[PDB]
Structure formats: structure tokens, C-alpha cells
Design a protein around this nucleic acid. Structure first.
Ligand SMILES: Nc1nc2c(ncn2[C@H]2C[C@H](O)[C@@H](COP(=O)(O)OP(=O)(O)OP(=O)(O)O)O2)c(=O)[nH]1
Ligand SMILES: [Ca+2]
Ligand SMILES: [Ca+2]
Ligand SMILES: [Ca+2]
Length: 341
DNA sequence: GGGGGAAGGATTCA
DNA sequence: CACGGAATCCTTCCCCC
């Protein structure tokens, strides 16, 4: 198997540049303005000019402002980025039927029976890059290896605007040298549990009793890590399909007042339905974010599809159930639909 | 004992 | 001060043969 992974560079910020070239060169910060107060909200991402000073995805807009008060701040326009993304995805399809769209800016191509050895794979990388850059003026980073995981690791290593191959030889090498935290799917929580077990590199998962590892991080995560340790990871490139659709909004102020909360909720329902289009869900969950930034939810699955009418009243109950099972005020309210017919 | 879901949360990544 | 969107996995509770 020969996997070629593509990851678009500082994607949202780069799209804003393509659409408004005068922005290129200076720091650009794409933000999610929550509407609470003046600059309430977080950063979705920022171009590298901005990252040089620590402004990156996830930090409060206010903190970014302190660092770069003169940077350009733009509201996130998700739908725009999506269409450009879709176009780039259609271009990659011209390189392989076997394609797995992982996110708005990521894709795995199974180019096994489309090229032999890594030399040809790499060159397919350059072609793909060059093509995308000429067709959409978007630079991306390419990662190539024997499976999705090391292909993605390949890309993380070459960012930004790069291309890299991790051949059968380096795969073996990284299994012994690569900090396990750098492995896709190992976040802060899992990294710490591994540390406390003494597991620092993929290789270490091989000398520990499975049941031990299993008990601390889960059977799934344990098999995953060992699988990679034994160069036995080979998940196929497959098409993914949306499984849930929803919306969540930040209220103007915290509240436990049903009447005060409902309009935001209903708004969340209306928007979610528009995004559902032809899809009919059988499950609905009401999601609330407490005053202390905590997340609580209540849902329900029906034996049939849910009409918008059924969503409204059912979602009101769930919200009442949330309020009557958690004393904290609510800060953000939303809904999610799943189990599509 | 264990097959088969469903509900609420944990964790991760974009 | 702390955004939106979403997938997979885990524990727990049920119903039943
Ligand atoms: N709203 C929101 N969107 C995010 C967040 N993180 C990532 N995104 C979106 C916008 C990013 O441009 C896009 C791609 O994510 P990456 O994790 O690939 O970041 P980006 O491509 O901007 O930079 P990169 O060159 O990959 O290091 O996903 C986030 O924390 N909040
Ligand atoms: Ca990216
Ligand atoms: Ca990405
Ligand atoms: Ca990590």
C-alpha cells in the first residue's frame, strides 16, 4: 500500500488571501465572534505571519488582539471555505478513485495501483500540488508512506507548503524515535496516562502487558498503538459520510430561563434542518454548555424520522430535563441530529 | 453469560 | 476569556433468552 495524504496550508486564512490578495504578507486572523461582547470568541486559525507571534487556532480573540492589535481580523465564512474545499477535492479525485475525505482540508488517496515505488509516488505529489496551486492558488503539504497514520505524520513534518515521504525504513525508525504524543489520536489526556506507564515511544507498547495498557487507555486505543508498533497498521482508504448535523449558538448572557433560552434553541433547530436537506434523522440531542464551560446533553431516538415539528417540542423537553438535572446556568445551547434514514 | 441498543460523557482533531 | 462542528470510543443501564 502507498498512501498519499494532502493537508491544505493555514486553510481558512489562505482562502481569505486568495479572495483578497492585498491581505497577503500581513498577519491574518480568522475568528469566530460569539456575539456576547465586543471581541468575545475564539480564533479559528491564522496565517503563519500571525503564528510567528503565538496567534493560533483556539486562543481567545482578545488575547490575539493584545499580541497583534494591528493584524487583520476577519469573521469566519465557513460556507466559502467549504466550496473552495470541494473544488480541490474534485481535483484530487482525478488522481484516484480510492479517496478518503477526512475533513474540510484533508484527504487520503490510495495510489497503490496508480504508481509503483516511492519515487513515482513523490512525483505524483508534486503534480498534485502544482495542479491545485494553479487551479485554486492554494498551497498544500503532502505526506506519503505505507499507511494513513505515517502519511499524516509525513505531512505534519513537512508543513507548510511541503512534501515528504516516510519509506518503509523511516517508519521502523520513527517507531523507536517518535515521541508517542506526536501520534495521531493521542491527545493530552492519553499522552499523560502513557507517560505514567512509562510508554514514551510506539515501541514501548510492545513490552507492556496488553491488559495493563488496555485498562489505562482502552482496548481500541491499545490495539491501535500496538498495531503501529508492529508495522501492522493498514486501515483502508474509505469514503466517510456525515453521521450527525447540528448547530450550537452562544446566548447574549447566561440563563436558566426557558423562555429566554428557547429562541436560540429554535434558531438552532431551524438552521440544522436547512443543513439536513434531504436527510431525515431518527435521533436528536440537545446540547448545552454550562456557565463553567462544561458540556451536558440529552437525546432521544425514535423508530421513525423526526419532522421539524417533532424536533421543536421534543427538544423543549430535553432542555427542561437538562435544567432539572443540573443547577448551573447555560451559556451556549444547541442541537444535533443523527441516525439518518 | 452474553447479544443488541440506547443514553451521557470522554477524548481528539479540524 | 474560553468558538463551531463532528467522529469514535467507553462505561453504564436495559431487556431478554
Ligand atoms: N472554528 C474552528 N476551526 C478550526 C479550529 N482548528 C482548525 N479549524 C479549521 C480552520 C483551519 O484552517 C482548518 C484546518 O485546520 P488545521 O488544523 O489543518 O489548521 P490550518 O490548516 O489552518 O493550519 P496548518 O497549515 O494545517 O498548520 O480547520 C478550531 O479550533 N476552531
Ligand atoms: Ca491544514
Ligand atoms: Ca487539517
Ligand atoms: Ca498529540
Amino acid at each position: 500500500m502507498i498512501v498519499l495524504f494532502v493537508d491544505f496550508d493555514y486553510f481558512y486564512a489562505q482562502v481569505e488571501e486568495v479572495l483578497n490578495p492585498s491581505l497577503k504578507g500581513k498577519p491574518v486572523v480568522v475568528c469566530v465572534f460569539s456575539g456576547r461582547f465586543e471581541d468575545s470568541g475564539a480564533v479559528a486559525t491564522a496565517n503563519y505571519e500571525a503564528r510567528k507571534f503565538g496567534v493560533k487556532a483556539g486562543i481567545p480573540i482578545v488575547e490575539a488582539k493584545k499580541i497583534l492589535p494591528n493584524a487583520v481580523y476577519l469573521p469566519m465564512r465557513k460556507e466559502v471555505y467549504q466550496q473552495v474545499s470541494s473544488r480541490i477535492m474534485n481535483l484530487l479525485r482525478e488522481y484516484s478513485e480510492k479517496i478518503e475525505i477526512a475533513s474540510i482540508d484533508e484527504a487520503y488517496l490510495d495510489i497503490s495501483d496508480k504508481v509503483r515505488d516511492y519515487r513515482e509516488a513523490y512525483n505524483l505529489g508534486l503534480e498534485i500540488k502544482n495542479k491545485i496551486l494553479e487551479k485554486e492558488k492554494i498551497t498544500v503539504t503532502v505526506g506519503i508512506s505505507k499507511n494513513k497514520v505515517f502519511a499524516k505524520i509525513a505531512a505534519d513534518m513537512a508543513k507548510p507548503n511541503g512534501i515528504k515521504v516516510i519509506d518503509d525504513e523511516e517508519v521502523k525508525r520513527l517507531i523507536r524515535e517518535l515521541d508517542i504524543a506526536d501520534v495521531p489520536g493521542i491527545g493530552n489526556i492519553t499522552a499523560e496516562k502513557l507517560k505514567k506507564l512509562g510508554i514514551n515511544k510506539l515501541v514501548d507498547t510492545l513490552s507492556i502487558e496488553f491488559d495493563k495498557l488496555k485498562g489505562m487507555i482502552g482496548e481500541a486505543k491499545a490495539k491501535y498503538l500496538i498495531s503501529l508498533a508492529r508495522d501492522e497498521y493498514n486501515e483502508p482508504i474509505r469514503t466517510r459520510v456525515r453521521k450527525s448535523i447540528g448547530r450550537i449558538v452562544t446566548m447574549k448572557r447566561n440563563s436558566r430561563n426557558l423562555e429566554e433560552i428557547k429562541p436560540y434553541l429554535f434558531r438552532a433547530i431551524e438552521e440544522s434542518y436547512y443543513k439536513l436537506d434531504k436527510r431525515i434523522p431518527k435521533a436528536i440531542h440537545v446540547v448545552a454548555v454550562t456557565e463553567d464551560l462544561d458540556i451536558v446533553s440529552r437525546g432521544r431516538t425514535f423508530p421513525h424520522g423526526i419532522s421539524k415539528e417533532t424536533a421543536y417540542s421534543e427538544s423543549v423537553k430535553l432542555l427542561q430535563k437538562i435544567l432539572e438535572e443540573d443547577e448551573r446556568k447555560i451559556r451556549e445551547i444547541g442541537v444535533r441530529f443523527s441516525k439518518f434514514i
